[PDB]
């Protein structure tokens, strides 16, 4: 039990969720702390780059009223990236890297459309009873209607801007809106930026793994379109190819409306929209991490070693003139020499 006992909602409305809405996996977890932003422990966790769920930021307070109808009326007439998938797992592909690996075609199609088309496409699926799932993921721009601009202005910019200043982070790079169907799964991956994951509607089970568990999670090659994702099928883990997955230990939480999960830079995260929980809405805030310090302190952090491993794969990819020779060169380098 990583998320703990399901939290009770105000007004004696009882269980927000129950454990049968969670998917079953083979690894143990422990709870990410649920704290208040006023708690000095929450401050220590963020500076030390450990995950924390803040319960009372009011970061996206004006957005707590968002649903499909309100958004459809006010978000405007931009294009929204909608990812499709025949299964519940939404594996993403770097379309630019799809050239290096000709021997693969994607399984989660992206399709640009207008917001009203996505809403029509969604309740079509619920009435046809079909198995197809959709996931709208669109960076917020200024092509957005007046009432949503007002809501944006209503975010707690005082709090998050001071968090950016106190941690030495870079600038805010994007505000990703995510709207998803129940049961949708974003499979385990890590990002290179600091993330405040602000939950708006519905419930999302977030399972995180620290950077020192690189060896248990087996990311794709840097040049692979699925760069930064685990190769391990959490529903059917191949212990023969991925034996250290038997040693993986996660940090787990379930975020609901009003909650803000800090996902530290380089922390693995597996996110799922709770089964039979309806649609989920999230806004993400991405900050570039703080610049690498003056004097390098040893021993290195785990995330610096990941960054080192990424640079070696990149450097080899361009030195050899072909990303596909990285593998054989690296094996030639270690076989009988370092293993």
DSSP string, 3-52: S-SPPEETTTTEES--GGGSPP-SS-EEEPPEE-TTSHHHHHHHHTT--E
d(CA 189, CA 92): 10
Residue 203 engages ligand A1L2L in binding (rule: CB under 6 A): no
Nearer to ligand A1L2L, 275 or 300 (CB): 275
> Does 142 count as an annotated binding residue?
yes
d(CA 214, CA 236): 19
**Which among Zn ion, ligand A1L2L, none contacts residue 92 (Cβ within 5 to 8 A by kind)?**
ligand A1L2L
Binders of Zn ion among residues 210 to 239 (CB under 5 A) are none
Q: How far is the CB of 278 from ligand A1L2L (least distance, A)?
A: 15
Residue 179 engages ligand A1L2L in binding (rule: CB under 6 A): no
Residue 20: other Cβ atoms inside 10 A: 9
Site string for ligand A1L2L, 261-280 (x = CB under 6 A): --------x-x---------
Distance of CA 72 to the CA centre of its chain: 24
Residue 192 engages Zn ion in binding (rule: CB under 5 A): no
Secondary element (H or E) of residue 138: strand 133-139
Residue 191 engages Zn ion in binding (rule: CB under 5 A): yes
Residues forming a β-bridge with 111? 82
Residue 63 engages ligand A1L2L in binding (rule: CB under 6 A): no
* Phi and psi, residue 262, nearest 5°: -85, 115
* Residues at the interface with Zn ion (CB under 5 A): 191
What are the binding residues for substrate? 142, 171-173, 191-193, 228-229, 290, 311
* Residues at the interface with ligand A1L2L (CB under 6 A): 92, 137, 178, 186, 191, 204, 269, 271, 282, 286
């Amino acid at each position: 039990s990583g998320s703990g006992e399901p939290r009770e909602e105000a007004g004696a409305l009882g269980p927000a969720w129950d454990e049968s809405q969670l998917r079953s996996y083979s690894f143990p977890t422990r709870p990410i702390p649920r704290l208040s932003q006023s708690d000095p422990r929450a401050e220590e966790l963020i500076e030390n780059e450990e995950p924390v769920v803040l319960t009372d930021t009011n970061l996206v307070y004006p957005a707590l009223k968002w649903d499909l109808e309100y958004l459809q009326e006010n978000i405007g007439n931009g294009d929204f990236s909608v990812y499709s998938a025949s299964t519940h797992k939404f594996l993403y592909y770097d379309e630019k890297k799809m050239a290096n690996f000709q021997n693969f075609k994607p399984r989660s199609n992206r399709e640009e459309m207008k917001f009203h088309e996505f809403v029509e496409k969604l309740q079509d699926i619920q009435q046809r009873g079909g198995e197809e799932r959709l996931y709208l993921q669109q960076t917020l721009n200024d092509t957005v209607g007046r009432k949503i601009v007002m809501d944006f202005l209503g975010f707690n910019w005082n709090w998050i801007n001071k968090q950016q200043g106190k941690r030495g982070w870079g600038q805010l790079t994007s505000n990703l809106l995510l709207i998803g169907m129940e049961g949708n799964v974003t499979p385990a991956h890590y990002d290179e930026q600091q993330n405040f994951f602000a939950q708006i509607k519905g419930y999302k089970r977030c399972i995180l793994f620290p950077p020192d568990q690189f060896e248990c999670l087996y990311p794709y090659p840097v040049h692979h379109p699925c760069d930064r994702q685990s190769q391990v099928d959490f529903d059917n883990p191949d212990y023969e190819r991925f034996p250290n997955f038997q040693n993986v230990v996660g940090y787990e939480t379930v975020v609901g409306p009003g909650d803000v999960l800090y996902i530290p830079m380089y922390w693995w995260h597996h996110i799922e929209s709770l089964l039979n929980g309806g649609i989920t809405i999230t806004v993400n805030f991405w900050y570039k991490g703080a610049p690498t310090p003056k004097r390098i302190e040893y021993p290195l952090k785990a995330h610096q070693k990941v960054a080192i491993m990424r640079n070696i794969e990149k450097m080899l990819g361009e030195a050899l003139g072909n990303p596909q020779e990285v593998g054989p060169l690296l094996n030639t380098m270690i076989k009988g020499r370092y293993n």
